Design a protein around this ligand. Structure first.
Ligand SMILES: [Zn+2]
Ligand SMILES: [Zn+2]
Ligand SMILES: [Zn+2]
Length: 85
DNA sequence: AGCGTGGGCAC
DNA sequence: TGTGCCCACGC
């Protein structure tokens, strides 16, 4: 990991500089992506997309066992295991 | 549960 | 780099 975060209080190191560039947003407080519905700002475009589903009710991920739908794949993943014994 | 949000990284 | 997934933790 050649790329160290230059912020004094931070000890994170990255394999790729582009990842350090994304990381630095934490320290600069930069949130370039805004939700046009509630005007909230987010650090990443991926997180803005899933956030928008909280407004639209879009839930693309259905449980294979019971059909319950979720906005995110990881939510469905956390859910499916409840069907275990 | 609902969902913010960082880290890894494919493309 | 931008875009956007998986994974994982947190409240
Ligand atoms: Zn840092
Ligand atoms: Zn919003
Ligand atoms: Zn289910």
């Amino acid at each position: 990991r050649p790329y160290a975060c230059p912020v004094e209080s931070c000890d994170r190191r990255f394999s790729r500089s582009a990842d350090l560039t994304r990381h630095i947003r934490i320290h600069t407080g930069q949130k370039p992506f805004q939700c046009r519905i509630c005007m909230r700002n987010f650090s990443r475009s991926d997180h803005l997309t899933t956030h928008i589903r909280t407004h639209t009710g879009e839930k693309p991920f259905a449980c294979d066992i019971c059909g319950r739908k979720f906005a995110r794949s990881d939510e469905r993943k956390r859910h499916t295991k409840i069907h275990l014994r």
